[PDB]
Amino acid sequence: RTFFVGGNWKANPKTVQEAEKLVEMLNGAKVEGNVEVVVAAPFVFLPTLQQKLRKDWKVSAENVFTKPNGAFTGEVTVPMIKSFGIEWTILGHSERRDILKEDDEFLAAKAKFALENGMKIIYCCGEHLSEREAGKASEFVSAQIEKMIPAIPAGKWDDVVIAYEPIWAIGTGKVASTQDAQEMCKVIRDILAAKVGADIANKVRILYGGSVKPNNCNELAACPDVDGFLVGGASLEAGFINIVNSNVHSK
Amino acid sequence: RTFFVGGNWKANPKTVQEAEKLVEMLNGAKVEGNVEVVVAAPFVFLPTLQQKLRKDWKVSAENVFTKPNGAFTGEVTVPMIKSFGIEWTILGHSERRDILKEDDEFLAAKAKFALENGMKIIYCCGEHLSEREAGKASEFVSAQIEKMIPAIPAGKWDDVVIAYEPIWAIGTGKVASTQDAQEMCKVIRDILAAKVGADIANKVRILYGGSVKPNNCNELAACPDVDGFLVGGASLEAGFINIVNSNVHSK
Ligand code: NA
């Protein structure tokens, strides 16, 4: 499996002028090793990223709707993204599940529609504090993945990347260890193996989407079931390249 | 009050190439009378609209979030829009209230943040079938407007336009009359007069945001409390200019 690093800018930066400066920074970055890099940005910055970002990396949307077009004021759809040549979207990020109240049914429908229409997806999952403390993390994550599975069209697993978010470690006063990251990525791989088979489980990249910074990326990358990262705040900083380059520590 | 016509493209068209063709069509349109025209489009098409649309009209977003930036994956914020020179946003469209579950608290916070940050807003309201049938339309609409009022900063009413959507006539098997449109726009004007005073009530444009087409725009425009339209499907068609030009029938 090729190591995979997505930079999720989230709702940043504030201005297109800043977005352009970030792209200029990324374009000069020297990548070591072998790694697939995707950069996700706010919708209004996607055209300028697609035009200006180094072509060995790919641009990603941060969300899409379930339909091709129509009476859905405020929503952006897959065909609109594709019309710019953009190939990726994030789906099911914790922030959308929690703040924007996106449920699994909505997310499954997005995954199916996106894949049927030629997109590649970074599909996010992860358990909250209660389930972590109860020792029921695998059960919760399995239920999420089990909702996602039927959405994936036959022959589309090549176009799926899964990101694990330790939501129990986001704004809770608890922190995740490297071991925690490894354990949950392995949990996901095993769910895939049990439900859709070893061939799929062996090719699907499973990312760690908790806090990833230059000070912990190498140790995390070395974990055997961690295939890369969905990076938050560091994606806006010069440290992003350190994280991209942590691939050399992943065997 | 200057007649006001917003074209809400909603989640259309499917491609940036189609968006560009639409802009070319709009740019050649001959406007008669005196009218303020705003065109709202999907986020990913906003940059090309801002660059290419005739400069006597203004571009609008179809939604914005409540914060300047941050950990809100998928969301677009006011500063991002403004960085392109875009001055307008729609807020509280029925489709977002209903499909995306946006509540009045969320919408009030958007209105306040947007106005504080120099945006102009088209704020949408309107009652559903139950309330229409119960003869409780004014009560429902008043509650919505009463939630909006405290959000409007002092001195910002010049930058507010309100759109009435007869949601009771959208996908219900019932249709709205011209008289219905007039009555509800008057209802809103009277709520403003009672709550924030005649001066504000007299300057705020109140739009009809039900079905507006070339075959009914002139009669609707002539209604005394109807100050313009938030146009749906016709905004994607050559008929949009007929609607823009209905201003000559509004005294
Ligand atoms: Na690894």
Ligand code: NA
């Ligand atoms: Na009128």
